[PDB]
Amino acid sequence: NLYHIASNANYSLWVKNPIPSMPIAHNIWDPHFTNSTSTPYSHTIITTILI
Amino acid sequence: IFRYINTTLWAKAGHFNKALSKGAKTTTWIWNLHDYAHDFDIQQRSTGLIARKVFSSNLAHLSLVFFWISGMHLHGAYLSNYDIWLKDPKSITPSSHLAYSLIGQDILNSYTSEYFSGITITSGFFQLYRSEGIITQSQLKYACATSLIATLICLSGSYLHMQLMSKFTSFYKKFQSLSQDHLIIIFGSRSTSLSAHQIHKMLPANPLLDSGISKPSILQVISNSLSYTLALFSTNLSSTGKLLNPSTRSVFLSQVAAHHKTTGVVFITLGLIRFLTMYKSQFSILTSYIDYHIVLSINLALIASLSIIVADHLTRTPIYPHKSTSYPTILCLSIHHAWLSGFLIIGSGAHASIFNLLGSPTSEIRHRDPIYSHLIWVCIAIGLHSFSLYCHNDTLEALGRPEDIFHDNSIQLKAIFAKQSFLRAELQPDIEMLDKKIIRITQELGTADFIVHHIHAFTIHVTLLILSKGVLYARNSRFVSDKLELGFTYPCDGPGRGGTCQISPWDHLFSAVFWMYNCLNVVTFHYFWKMQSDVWGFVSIQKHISHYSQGDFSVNSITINGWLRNLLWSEASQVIQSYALSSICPYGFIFLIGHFIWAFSLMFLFSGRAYWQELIESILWSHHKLKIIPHIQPRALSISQGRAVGFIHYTLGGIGSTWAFIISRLLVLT
Amino acid sequence: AKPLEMFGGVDIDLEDTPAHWTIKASPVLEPCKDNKKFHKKLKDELYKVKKNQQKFAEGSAAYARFNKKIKMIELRETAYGDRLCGKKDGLPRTIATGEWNVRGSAMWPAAIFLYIAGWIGWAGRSYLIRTNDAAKEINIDVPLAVTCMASGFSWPVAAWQEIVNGEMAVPNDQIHNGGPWNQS
Amino acid sequence: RVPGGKRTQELGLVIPMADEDGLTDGQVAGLFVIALVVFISAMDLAKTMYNGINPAKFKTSKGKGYISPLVKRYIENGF
Amino acid sequence: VITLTENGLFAKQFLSALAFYREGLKPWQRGLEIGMAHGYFLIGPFTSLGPLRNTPEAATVGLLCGCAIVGIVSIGGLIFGSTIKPTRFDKDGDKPGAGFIEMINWHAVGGLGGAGFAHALITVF
Amino acid sequence: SHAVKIYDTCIGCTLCVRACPTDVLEMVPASINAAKQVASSPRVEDCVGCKRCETACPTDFLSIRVYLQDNEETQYSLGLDLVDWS
Amino acid sequence: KYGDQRKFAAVLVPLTTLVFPAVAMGMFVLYSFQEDAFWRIVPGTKRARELDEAWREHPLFANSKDPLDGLINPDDYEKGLEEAWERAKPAGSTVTVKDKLKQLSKQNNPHWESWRAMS
Numbered sequence A: 001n002l003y004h005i006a007s008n009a010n011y012s013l014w015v016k017n018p019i020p021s022m023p024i025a026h027n028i029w030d031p032h033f034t035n036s037t038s039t040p041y042s043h044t045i046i047t048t049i050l051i
Numbered sequence B: 001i002f003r004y005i006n007t008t009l010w011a012k013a014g015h016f017n018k019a020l021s022k023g024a025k026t027t028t029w030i031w032n033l034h035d036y037a038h039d040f041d042i043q044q045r046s047t048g049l050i051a052r053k054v055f056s057s058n059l060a061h062l063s064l065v066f067f068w069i070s071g072m073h074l075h076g077a078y079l080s081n082y083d084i085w086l087k088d089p090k091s092i093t094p095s096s097h098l099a100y101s102l103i104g105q106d107i108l109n110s111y112t113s114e115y116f117s118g119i120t121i122t123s124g125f126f127q128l129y130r131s132e133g134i135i136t137q138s139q140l141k142y143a144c145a146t147s148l149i150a151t152l153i154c155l156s157g158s159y160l161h162m163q164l165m166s167k168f169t170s171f172y173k174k175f176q177s178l179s180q181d182h183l184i185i186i187f188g189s190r191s192t193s194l195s196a197h198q199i200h201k202m203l204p205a206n207p208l209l210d211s212g213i214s215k216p217s218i219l220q221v222i223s224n225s226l227s228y229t230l231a232l233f234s235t236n237l238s239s240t241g242k243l244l245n246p247s248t249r250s251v252f253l254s255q256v257a258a259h260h261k262t263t264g265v266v267f268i269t270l271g272l273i274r275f276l277t278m279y280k281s282q283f284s285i286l287t288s289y290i291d292y293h294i295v296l297s298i299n300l301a302l303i304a305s306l307s308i309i310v311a312d313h314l315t316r317t318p319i320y321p322h323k324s325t326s327y328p329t330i331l332c333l334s335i336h337h338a339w340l341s342g343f344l345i346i347g348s349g350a351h352a353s354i355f356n357l358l359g360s361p362t363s364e365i366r367h368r369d370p371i372y373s374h375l376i377w378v379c380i381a382i383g384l385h386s387f388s389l390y391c392h393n394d395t396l397e398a399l400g401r402p403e404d405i406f407h408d409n410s411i412q413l414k415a416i417f418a419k420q421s422f423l424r425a426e427l428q429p430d431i432e433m434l435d436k437k438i439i440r441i442t443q444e445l446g447t448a449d450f451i452v453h454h455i456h457a458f459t460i461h462v463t464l465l466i467l468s469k470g471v472l473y474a475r476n477s478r479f480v481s482d483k484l485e486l487g488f489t490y491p492c493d494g495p496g497r498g499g500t501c502q503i504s505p506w507d508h509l510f511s512a513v514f515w516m517y518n519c520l521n522v523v524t525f526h527y528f529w530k531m532q533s534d535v536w537g538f539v540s541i542q543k544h545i546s547h548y549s550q551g552d553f554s555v556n557s558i559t560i561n562g563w564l565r566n567l568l569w570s571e572a573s574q575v576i577q578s579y580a581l582s583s584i585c586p587y588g589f590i591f592l593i594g595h596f597i598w599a600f601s602l603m604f605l606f607s608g609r610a611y612w613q614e615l616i617e618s619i620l621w622s623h624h625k626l627k628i629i630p631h632i633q634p635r636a637l638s639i640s641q642g643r644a645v646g647f648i649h650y651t652l653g654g655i656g657s658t659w660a661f662i663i664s665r666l667l668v669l670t
Numbered sequence C: 001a002k003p004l005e006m007f008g009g010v011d012i013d014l015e016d017t018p019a020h021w022t023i024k025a026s027p028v029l030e031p032c033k034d035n036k037k038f039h040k041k042l043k044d045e046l047y048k049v050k051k052n053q054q055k056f057a058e059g060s061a062a063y064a065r066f067n068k069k070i071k072m073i074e075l076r077e078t079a080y081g082d083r084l085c086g087k088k089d090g091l092p093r094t095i096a097t098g099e100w101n102v103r104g105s106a107m108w109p110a111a112i113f114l115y116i117a118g119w120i121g122w123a124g125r126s127y128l129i130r131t132n133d134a135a136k137e138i139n140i141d142v143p144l145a146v147t148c149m150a151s152g153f154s155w156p157v158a159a160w161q162e163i164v165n166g167e168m169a170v171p172n173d174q175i176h177n178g179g180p181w182n183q184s
Numbered sequence D: 001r002v003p004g005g006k007r008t009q010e011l012g013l014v015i016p017m018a019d020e021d022g023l024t025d026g027q028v029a030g031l032f033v034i035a036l037v038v039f040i041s042a043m044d045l046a047k048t049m050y051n052g053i054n055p056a057k058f059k060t061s062k063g064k065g066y067i068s069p070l071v072k073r074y075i076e077n078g079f
Numbered sequence E: 001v002i003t004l005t006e007n008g009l010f011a012k013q014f015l016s017a018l019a020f021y022r023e024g025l026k027p028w029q030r031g032l033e034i035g036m037a038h039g040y041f042l043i044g045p046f047t048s049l050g051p052l053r054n055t056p057e058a059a060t061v062g063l064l065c066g067c068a069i070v071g072i073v074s075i076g077g078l079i080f081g082s083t084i085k086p087t088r089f090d091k092d093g094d095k096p097g098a099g100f101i102e103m104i105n106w107h108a109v110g111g112l113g114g115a116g117f118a119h120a121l122i123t124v125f
Numbered sequence F: 001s002h003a004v005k006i007y008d009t010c011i012g013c014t015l016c017v018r019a020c021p022t023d024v025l026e027m028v029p030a031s032i033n034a035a036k037q038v039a040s041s042p043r044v045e046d047c048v049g050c051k052r053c054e055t056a057c058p059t060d061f062l063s064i065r066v067y068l069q070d071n072e073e074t075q076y077s078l079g080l081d082l083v084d085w086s
Numbered sequence G: 001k002y003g004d005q006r007k008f009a010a011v012l013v014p015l016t017t018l019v020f021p022a023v024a025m026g027m028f029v030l031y032s033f034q035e036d037a038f039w040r041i042v043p044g045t046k047r048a049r050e051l052d053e054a055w056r057e058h059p060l061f062a063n064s065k066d067p068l069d070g071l072i073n074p075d076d077y078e079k080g081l082e083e084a085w086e087r088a089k090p091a092g093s094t095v096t097v098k099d100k101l102k103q104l105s106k107q108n109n110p111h112w113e114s115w116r117a118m119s
């Protein structure tokens, strides 16, 4: 848990504005998703994340 | 003869079975007494008594059905708004069912007419009465009187035949006589009698109502005396079913009368043909199937199949006047007969098993392994195929890949044979509508219809697998080699051989009831969603159609989430938000009660009787402490009884849940 | 210092007097006849039933039955006025503090039910004691059964007189204690 | 991101994402070295637990065993 | 109990003439024949109605997936031959199960070949 | 294989022997009851475990007790038909 | 960029959720056919016999399985039991303590742990 918060997460940004922000559990790497468009779990071209 | 009809056995409960003669030592005795009540085969005395009991009980049940018909007729004559429904059926909901003003139950009666408040009936009896030319209250009075007289006659006949029939009685075994007289005199000579009834009382009456004279000059024209109208007054050429009656939105009753006349002629001619026709192949079946349980199973299967044909033919082959627009009536008439088809099919399987255990089976039981094995394979194949197309669509829609799912706008599985099945109906290239309501439009079958039909096939095949496995493996098996000596219904043979629970044919029925229920719950949901989405609904004057579900089926029923959201959640808003709403309060309450009963069944389904026996003993300790000794010793339910109670509560609760869910929604929408 | 905000909405009495031990002194509750939610709820009941009534004919029997229902609703409104309801729901409350002298108290129904339930149990126990046979449980001796049923009225005294005189309970060494848990 | 649920949309709750990397590849490799050490030690422990204690070691194994001086005291202090 | 579909003349001669049963075939020949059949057939379900069914290639993906299926079933056959060790294909005086292992290896080779041949036919034609 | 044990409370019913579907039980002479006979289980390797013997035993608590041993099952104690373990 | 950790994912996720599970399943089905398979729960394995004998070879655990282990001086116990039975022996009873105990120890249960005959 500590690693995934360190690497695949946004603790450095959530700590600044915790009330409206949302933490990240870890990235999503699943080849079954759409290789096109953008999943509802990612900010367009950015990687996929879980709260 | 009748001097032996004595009440001395009324006080002596359990007299009919010699296993209950020891007295009620335990509470298991009560349940056994109730279980063996109608099991005439195992009861005391000779085989002649079995025949007497069977025939007289048939007559008594027939009297019971006649009493039920009489009650419906009296409700229609004296507790109904059938008058205003006759005058204006498109604005008045049928109601022959009131509720007393007690405990606020007054909230159940709802506005059906300006002078009537009551519970909207969905039995379709009003449409039947109108199709039966019943206009005045006197006609319903005399129908009720005749049904009561029939009840008394059948009750007296059941009473008499327990002593008219004797040890020498043999008329029930004369199967040639039974088949011939039944076929000819009933299917032929009574079908033409009903054709006569229609030609002489419906066509004189129903055209008069459709001609706009609901007055019918009171009795001056309605009371027959209309031999200037001609039998085929408004056939309008065409073909029967191609052109519906524009006023009542049904097939013209002249065509129905012609149908009954021709069917009676056909049945009479078949009875004449049976003097010399194809035989000597069903002859092994002829000799080996002369027994109560086998003929009972055959008749149950036949009647259930006829029930499902009735369910599918009562909805979009409209026969009854003003019935196609009455959507709750159509829904009820389909679904009730669907459920009865399922239940009577299950009963046919059970009595096939009973016949196998009592009588001697036939040749097909010797290669039972290939039969019940290819059945297993086909069940697995169509389960891993039909359902999973739903799982595949669901997963790929959740993943955001709608172009990879099985839909019309995607990889599409065309219903090739159904799309080429324009043979049925073969109507003209448009729809029919009576009054803001769609009478019938052809169901355009696509991918979702293909998948749900395969789901139906899979569920039917699994239920049949359970039934045929119970039937074929009744006498013996590779697991237990003396299942015949264990009887028809038994909990198990013991925890040995790894475990032998639920090997009896009774337990096979126990599982088959669950699987039949699951089979036609999907049938009920498919019908209930498809009709709302694609057939029923309002209209627009510009030929545009606004259905009730707004075409949700072809776009949502491809995924399980679609069924959960657009059927069990969005269409359950009517039943769930039904408190304090006059008509639909009981439906919301019954929805809640059905959930409670269904969950309550799980206590019997999941638990064994030993835990309950030990708990009962712990409680009996406290009872004995205070000198409260029940000498009918408290015993927990037997294993078979526990399973039976669980199955009954499960099916009853689930059926009640669906019942409320569909009926409340259709009453609100209409 | 405003206990309402300190405790997240709930308010505390803050006073230690015996006069506040009654339920009627609670600040959560309020007499129904001066509660806004009670008025609104029963007015909505009257409005809904009246709106249903207008849908029917004036001279019909349904109209008369709806008039009777309206009278029942208004009688219910005036009868529950002295009953306590919460200051936010308007639904009258049932008092389960043993008050014995408030509207909607649970002491009177408790007493009535306990008497009649003890009556039922005592009648059944008397019948079982006087019919020490299984044949008498399936074929009830109706005269004896109704005799015990009528005799059960004196259960609160007869039962206690049996308890103290050693005629109700039985020593544990005379009934089956339960399964063995040891032997070796 | 396409939010779901009423509260996220009606409050504007957002999930910030760092534009940097988080941990460099060197740090991940440093963690993976010790993860591999844990993995090897855990496989060894699984082997030892699977095989269990060998009492017959006193016939073949060298040495003569040892009971620590506190373990003797704990033996004779009671139980 | 003899039935037409298993004990008839045609059924018996068809089962006996299968690659698994045909007389006079070296184990590698049976493996090669079965593998060619499997590899040629397995390409179709992937190159069509697959995840990349509409891509310009849409067939090399199917080729890779079919070769993967052939390899997986060959690994399963190797597990079977190293655990059950059928000895009906071993010649006399050989390591038990050697014939079955040879058959499975040549099934893998034949699956590769059949998959490649189906892909070549699809691309060329 | 299961474990079928016969206790002293046996009264020589022979019902347990008659109810056994695989001839596990037999009657042996004895002197601890008026019937001068007690049951015995010389062939429990053929005991499937159906417990019909326990159903048939009329003593207050069964003079014959079958102890199920599932981690012990043999081909005879499982009633294997399609498959041979020998 | 916020990515660039997916270079690790594209190797690890396929590896540990496909290659490792498949290798583990194949190794498990291979292990299922060893004579040592599940030797701690499955009766009649060779390693179980060797472990039991190894325990019995330890000087402390030689007479560990005997339910009667513990009697420091069994001769004294037997003599006291015989003396106590002599004063209570019924009339001209011919049963001694020694043969009574010998026949009370010898029962007839051939089908007990008969699975100690294959491995």
Ligand code: CLA
Pocket: B034, B035, B036, B037, B038, B039, B040, B296, B300, B343, B344, B346, B347, B348, B350, B354, B488, B489, B506, B509, B513, B648, B652
């Ligand atoms: C024409 C129809 C018909 C007939 C004549 C029979 C006749 C018979 N069946 Mg049978 N059966 C039928 C249909 C039929 N069945 C169907 C459709 C099924 C499938 C469910 C079965 C399943 C079945 C089984 C599994 C068994 C029988 C048995 C029997 C025999 C004894 C029945 C008995 O004593 O029960 C006495 C009657 C009862 C116990 C009725 C109790 C009420 C039921 C169980 C619950 C119904 C709940 C109700 C609908 C909802 C309540 C309303 C709620 C709001 C409160 C007898 C030969 C038994 C036997 O031994 O055969 C030889 C047996 O084991 N049948």
Ligand SMILES: CC1=C(/C=C/C(C)=C/C=C/C(C)=C/C=C/C=C(C)/C=C/C=C(C)/C=C/C2=C(C)CCCC2(C)C)C(C)(C)CCC1
Pocket: E032, E036, E037, E038, E040, E041, E109, E110, E112, E113, E114, E116, E117
């Ligand atoms: C539908 C149908 C059917 C069936 C059919 C089938 C079953 C088919 C199959 C088919 C198939 C299944 C085919 C296949 C083929 C294959 C092939 C033709 C292959 C080839 C291959 C090759 C040629 C290869 C080569 C190679 C190798 C070997 C290695 C190296 C490389 C190479 C490439 C050189 C039936 C009769 C039932 C009926 C109806 C019709």
Ligand SMILES: CC1=C(C/C=C(\C)CCC[C@H](C)CCC[C@H](C)CCCC(C)C)C(=O)c2ccccc2C1=O
Pocket: B603, B604, B605, B607, B608, B609, B612, B613, B635, B636, B637, B638, B639, B641, B642, B643
């Ligand atoms: C609860 C339970 C019992 C105990 C339940 C018993 C003994 C039911 C009998 C209790 C009385 C006699 C039922 C009478 C009806 C109820 C008292 C009231 C029902 C109607 C109310 C709504 C008024 C079993 O014996 C049993 C046996 C096998 C499998 C599962 C179970 C099981 O789940």
Ligand code: SF4
Pocket: B491, B492, B493, B494, B495, B496, B499, B500, B501, B502, B608, B639
């Ligand atoms: S659990 Fe119940 S059904 Fe199963 S073997 Fe035991 S007693 Fe029979």
Ligand code: SF4
Pocket: F006, F009, F010, F011, F012, F013, F014, F015, F016, F017, F038, F039, F053, F056, F057, F058, F059, F062, F063, F064
């Ligand atoms: S049934 Fe019981 S009491 Fe009778 S002989 Fe067998 S073991 Fe003895």
Ligand code: SF4
Pocket: B496, F004, F019, F020, F021, F022, F023, F024, F025, F046, F047, F048, F049, F050, F051, F052, F053, F054, F066
């Ligand atoms: S459990 Fe069954 S097989 Fe075993 S001894 Fe008892 S009756 Fe015989």
